[PDB]
Design a protein around this ligand. Structure first.
Ligand code: CLA
Ligand code: CLA
Ligand code: CLA
Ligand code: CLA
Ligand code: CLA
Ligand code: CLA
Ligand code: CLA
Ligand SMILES: CCCCCCCCCCCCCCCCCC(=O)OC[C@H](CO[C@@H]1O[C@H](CO)[C@H](O)[C@H](O)[C@H]1O)OC(=O)CCCCCCCCCCCCCCCCC
Ligand SMILES: CC(/C=C/C=C(C)/C=C/[C@@]12O[C@]1(C)C[C@@H](O)CC2(C)C)=C\C=C\C=C(C)\C=C\C=C(C)\C=C\[C@@]12O[C@]1(C)C[C@@H](O)CC2(C)C
Ligand SMILES: CC1=C(/C=C/C(C)=C/C=C/C(C)=C/C=C/C=C(C)/C=C/C=C(C)/C=C/[C@@]23O[C@]2(C)C[C@@H](O)CC3(C)C)C(C)(C)C[C@H](O)C1
Ligand SMILES: CCCCCCCCCCCCO[C@H]1O[C@H](CO)[C@@H](O[C@H]2O[C@H](CO)[C@@H](O)[C@H](O)[C@H]2O)[C@H](O)[C@H]1O
Lengths: 199, 43, 158, 207
């Protein structure tokens, strides 16, 4: 249900609770305009899913190698490795593959249902849905898009964005990776904090 | 009254004086902590 | 290096200027008792001068034939700390100030005598608008997209 | 609860029209008119009730250790320098932990002033809650285990006045101890013995 981020504060009038994850949090009035609200609703899902994926694929290899079953570099050094193709080729492939899919996503935001059709095989399309929550091929196991699951997705995405910000900031001061920083905190809890890092 | 003194403290010259005093203090303290800077060296 | 200039950490004229300034300070320092306040002030000035020259040397500045640092503003990536990053900071702060001013003027114009609120500030209202400059680049961009930033030419008049 | 026929701070003087002896400890003292507007009066009442309890906690923990050290039961150092010693961790790392832990409670209290009765329920277990019914005077097993806070509106006012006066005394006592430590140069308990040894010369004018 609709909770409160600050017990004792009044909720905005435009956050009545028709969206998953509503907790009356918008102190700086970014979403007063109705269209800004839709744009930000989409942007939240996109940045959150990318952050979740990045955190998972940024943390799991480190612990796997530290266990001793793999020998891989840290996340801040994997871009300076030896691969079958140079970095420029990979970037160009990425740019070309992403212009298409991102404009395809954009055309559905501009007007829903416009790009549901399959371009090549003119026999497949996407049934009616809500923007940000497609189905069909994108839901292989065909789970249930209940209100509970959307809230569970949003909570983990919002957590992951802060986790990624923490990793980025902790690498620019310590320079030893997340797990090493955690084990250092767990070694001497009262002598290993951010205060000792700067002094 | 408190209402009247709060109204008088909100007039333009008084508020300008307070704002510029606070800003000048902030800039002086910053220049005392990081003096003689010609560039941004942190990143 | 760039434009025939020399790095300040390898310039003889730069070191000569540093030595001359330190000698000039030491000549004055040699006039007072070692533990007197003027002597301590002069010594602090000397240490500050040495620190300034060392930091200029090791921050990658370039020095001319006169032995003074020169700034590069053409876009070269070895000197962004000289103009580009502080310029971004200046633009961010200036945009914050302008945005909060415009929002106050728009919020106050709906009253019976708006001019009375321009010579006497409503601090209660201004304290809710000041924190919103934190995200002025997003708000201004969205306002520009939706056509709320600009007034049509036909509607402009006293 | 107006009570014009009450003692005041200055006999023969007219009490201000915005004070009528309703709040406990009211003696008609507000020369500068800092509480003329009724909106700021509640804020001032809460601020005084908080400063009072902080001062009482400070005073009760600043003289008894000194007295015990003077007698010789305990060997605690001077209170005026205990902040500059060395403990099991860095002094800066204690301040941040203090800030977090105290800030939780300070915000929890702040929420009640703006919206009374909106933070009386435990956020984790929604069954346990506080029985307090007035702002600034909570109540429950956490803040009133004995149960002295529930009584007729005769003993409640006298108890509140007792608390206010025992706090007002400590507010001056703490500042006096600070000034004496900064000026005299020794402990506060030693000053009492110095004044009780030669009560004619051992005064402020001695230095
Ligand atoms: C955002 C998604 C993302 C991206 C861009 C990368 C990118 C990379 N991964 Mg990672 N990875 C991800 C998600 C991602 N991973 C996820 C979700 C998992 C599952 C836990 C993994 C598990 C994984 C392993 C086990 C390894 C990589 C490795 C790599 C590197 C070479 C493989 C490649 O890209 O081809 C490259 C830096 C390889 C490497 O060398 O990493 C340093 C490697 O060994 N990844
Ligand atoms: C939210 C995830 C998270 C967690 C679990 C940690 C944990 C840790 N951080 Mg990191 N950190 C985070 C976010 C997080 N950080 C963020 C968002 C930033 C950017 C401001 C930083 C910046 C940072 C620095 C600069 C340093 C650490 C360090 C540390 C370690 C010592 C504790 C400390 O000093 O924290 C300091 C905490 C902060 C600066 C702000 C934390 C803000 C987050 C959002 C609070 C999360 C609250 C939430 C209720 C906790 C849930 C716990 C658990 C269930 C996940 C510890 C392993 C230190 C280290 O490396 O020690 C070896 C260190 O030097 N962190
Ligand atoms: C247009 C004219 C102009 C310009 C461009 C400058 C420029 C400069 N002058 Mg000069 N000056 C001028 C006119 C000018 N001056 C005039 C007219 C006079 C005579 C009154 C002087 C007298 C003078 C003196 C006496 C001195 C200077 C100095 C300086 C330097 C100051 C650097 C500094 O303090 O950095 C540090 C300051 C800042 C970084 C400002 C920070 C502002 C706020 C706090 C930023 C907050 C950001 C916030 C955190 C948000 C970002 C985060 C985000 C995540 C939200 C700089 C090179 C000083 C120097 O060292 O010269 C070499 C110096 O000693 N000037
Ligand atoms: C008309 C004059 C002019 C203009 C408009 C530019 C513009 C530019 N120059 Mg410069 N440049 C000029 C003349 C000019 N230059 C001349 C005459 C020379 C020869 C001395 C150079 C040599 C030069 C170099 C060597 C470099 C630039 C770079 C740049 C770019 C930096 C922008 C940037 O990343 O901002 C950052 C802004 C934000 C992050 C916001 C930008 C496109 C840099 C670049 O990367 O260009 C592609 C660069 O490396 N310029
Ligand atoms: C809300 C403040 C505000 C804003 C957003 C603008 C915006 C603009 N002004 Mg204007 N201006 C202002 C105030 C403002 N002005 C004031 C107070 C004066 C009297 C000195 C002027 C005098 C002025 C001139 C003479 C010119 C402009 C011009 C311009 C334009 C280009 C920018 C420029 O040259 O600025 C330069 C302006 C200044 C350096 C004046 C100082 C601006 C102050 C610092 C603004 C903030 C002060 C305010 C009291 C803050 C209130 C905060 C609130 C929360 C209570 C632009 C449309 C130029 C133009 O027409 O371009 C096409 C132009 O020629 N302005
Ligand atoms: C406002 C409340 C307050 C505060 C901030 C402090 C703060 C302090 N007390 Mg004190 N104390 C207080 C109330 C307080 N006390 C009360 C009410 C009593 C009961 C009479 C004591 C009895 C007491 C003793 C017996 C000792 C301290 C000591 C200390 C220090 C270490 C505390 C610790 O280890 O935990 C610290 C300066 C210790 C100290 O001074 O160590 C050098 C110490 O030995 N306190
Ligand atoms: C109620 C608090 C209180 C008490 C009991 C004392 C007691 C004492 N103080 Mg201290 N003092 C206090 C408050 C207090 N002080 C305050 C608020 C200040 C800051 C203005 C000072 C500043 C101070 C200095 C600088 C010195 C003393 C000294 C002394 C001693 C000699 C008397 C003297 O010279 O007083 C001087 C009095 C003042 C400078 C102003 C006192 C103002 C308060 C409000 C008076 C309260 C009186 C109280 C209502 C009486 C009934 C108390 C009740 C428990 C019976 C004596 C042990 C002297 C000492 O160390 O002697 C060995 C000394 O040098 N005091
Ligand atoms: C720890 C104790 C230390 C020592 C303390 C000593 C205290 C000595 C107090 C002396 C007596 C003061 C009585 C003041 C009563 C209120 C005066 C008043 O209404 O002021 C309020 C007035 C002005 O205020 C006007 O008062 C009018 C009265 O009808 C109306 O209420 C107006 O609305 C109001 O604006 O302020 C002054 O006259 C201040 C003059 C001095 C400048 C400061
Ligand atoms: C004096 C004071 C306030 C005085 C206010 C006055 C006179 C106001 C007067 C008036 O406004 C009125 C009423 C009405 C108006 O019309 C007129 C005026 C005249 C304007 C507050 C002190 C307030 C004092 C406070 C809160 C002190 C707190 C101290 C603490 C917590 C100490 C803790 C520790 O001592 C321990 C326990 C152990 C040690 O080891 C460590 C430390 C940290 C030193
Ligand atoms: C909501 C709100 C507000 C707050 C807003 C806030 C705090 C927003 C914060 C947003 C943040 C931190 C967003 C962060 C997004 C992060 C993202 C998308 C991260 C993506 C990371 C990826 C792809 C990582 C890839 C890699 O790691 C891998 C996988 C493997 C490595 O080898 C390679 C790299 C490239 C490093 C206010 C502004 C305060 C007021 C308003 O009123 C209401
Ligand atoms: C490197 C940077 C490259 C940037 C490339 C992208 C540029 C995008 C430009 C967007 C311009 C948005 O603003 C532009 O269209 C608005 C309408 O949508 C116009 O708005 C105008 O028309 C609206 C109706 O459509 C009215 O409600 C407005 O009152 C009126 O001002 C703006 O006057 C115009 O400036």
């Amino acid at each position: 249900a609709k909770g409160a981020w600050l017990p004792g504060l009044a909720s905005p009038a435009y956050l009545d609770g028709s969206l998953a994850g509503d907790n009356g949090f918008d102190p700086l009035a970014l979403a007063a305009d109705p269209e800004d609200l839709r744009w930000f609703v989409q942007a939240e899902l996109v940045n959150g899913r990318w952050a979740m994926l990045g955190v998972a694929g940024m943390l799991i290899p480190e612990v796997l190698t530290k266990g001793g079953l793999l020998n891989a570099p840290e996340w801040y050094d994997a871009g300076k490795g030896e691969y079958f193709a140079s970095s420029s080729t990979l970037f160009v492939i990425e740019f070309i593959l992403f212009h298409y899919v991102e404009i395809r996503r954009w055309q559905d935001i501009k007007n829903p249902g416009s790009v549901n059709q399959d371009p090549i095989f003119k026999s497949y399309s996407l049934p009616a849905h809500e923007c940000g929550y497609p189905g069909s091929v994108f839901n292989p196991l065909n789970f249930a898009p209940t209100l509970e699951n959307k809230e569970k997705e949003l909570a983990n995405g919002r957590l992951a964005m802060l986790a990624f910000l923490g990793f980025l900031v902790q690498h620019n001061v310590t320079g030893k990776g997340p797990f090493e920083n955690l084990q250092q905190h767990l070694a001497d809890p009262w002598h290993n904090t951010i205060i000792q890092t700067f002094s | 009254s408190m209402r009247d003194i709060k109204t008088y403290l909100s007039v333009a010259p008084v508020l300008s004086t307070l704002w510029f005093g606070a800003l000048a203090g902030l800039l002086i303290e910053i220049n005392r902590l990081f003096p003689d800077a010609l560039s941004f060296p942190f990143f | 290096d760039i434009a025939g200039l020399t790095p300040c950490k390898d310039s003889k004229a730069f070191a000569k200027r540093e030595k001359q300034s330190v000698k000039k300070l030491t000549s004055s320092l040699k006039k007072y008792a070692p533990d007197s306040a003027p002597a301590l002030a002069i010594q602090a000035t000397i240490d500050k001068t040495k620190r300034r020259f060392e930091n200029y040397g090791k921050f990658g500045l370039l020095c001319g034939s006169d032995g003074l640092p020169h700034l590069i503003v053409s876009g070269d990536q070895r000197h962004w700390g000289e103009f580009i990053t502080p310029g971004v900071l200046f633009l961010y702060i200036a945009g914050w100030i302008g945005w909060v001013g415009r929002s106050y003027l728009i919020a106050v114009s709906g009253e019976k005598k708006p001019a009375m609120r321009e010579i006497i500030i409503d601090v209660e209202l201004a304290s809710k608008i000041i924190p919103r400059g934190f995200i002025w680049p997003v708000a201004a961009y969205r306002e520009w997209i939706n056509g709320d930033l600009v007034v049509d030419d036909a509607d402009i008049g006293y | 609860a107006s009570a014009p026929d009450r003692p005041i701070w200055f006999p023969g003087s007219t009490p201000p029209p915005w004070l009528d002896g309703s709040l406990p400890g009211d003696f008609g003292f507000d020369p500068w008119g800092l509480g003329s507007d009724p909106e700021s009066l509640k804020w001032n009442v809460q601020a005084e009730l908080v400063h009072c309890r902080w001062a009482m906690l400070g005073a009760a923990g600043i003289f008894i250790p000194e007295l015990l050290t003077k007698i010789g039961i305990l060997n605690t150092p001077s209170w005026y320098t205990a902040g500059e010693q060395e403990y099991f961790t860095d002094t800066t790392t204690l301040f941040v932990v203090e800030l977090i832990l105290i800030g939780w409670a300070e915000g929890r209290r702040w929420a009640d002033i703006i919206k009374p009765g909106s933070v009386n329920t435990d956020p984790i277990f929604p069954n346990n809650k506080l029985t307090g019914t007035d702002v600034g005077y909570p109540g429950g097993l956490w803040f009133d285990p004995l149960g002295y806070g529930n009584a007729s509106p005769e003993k409640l006012k006298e108890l509140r006045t007792k608390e206010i006066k025992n706090g007002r005394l400590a507010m001056l006592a703490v500042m006096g101890a600070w000034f004496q430590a900064e000026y005299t140069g020794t402990g506060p308990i030693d000053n009492l013995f110095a004044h009780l040894a030669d009560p004619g010369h051992a005064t402020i004018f001695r230095a």
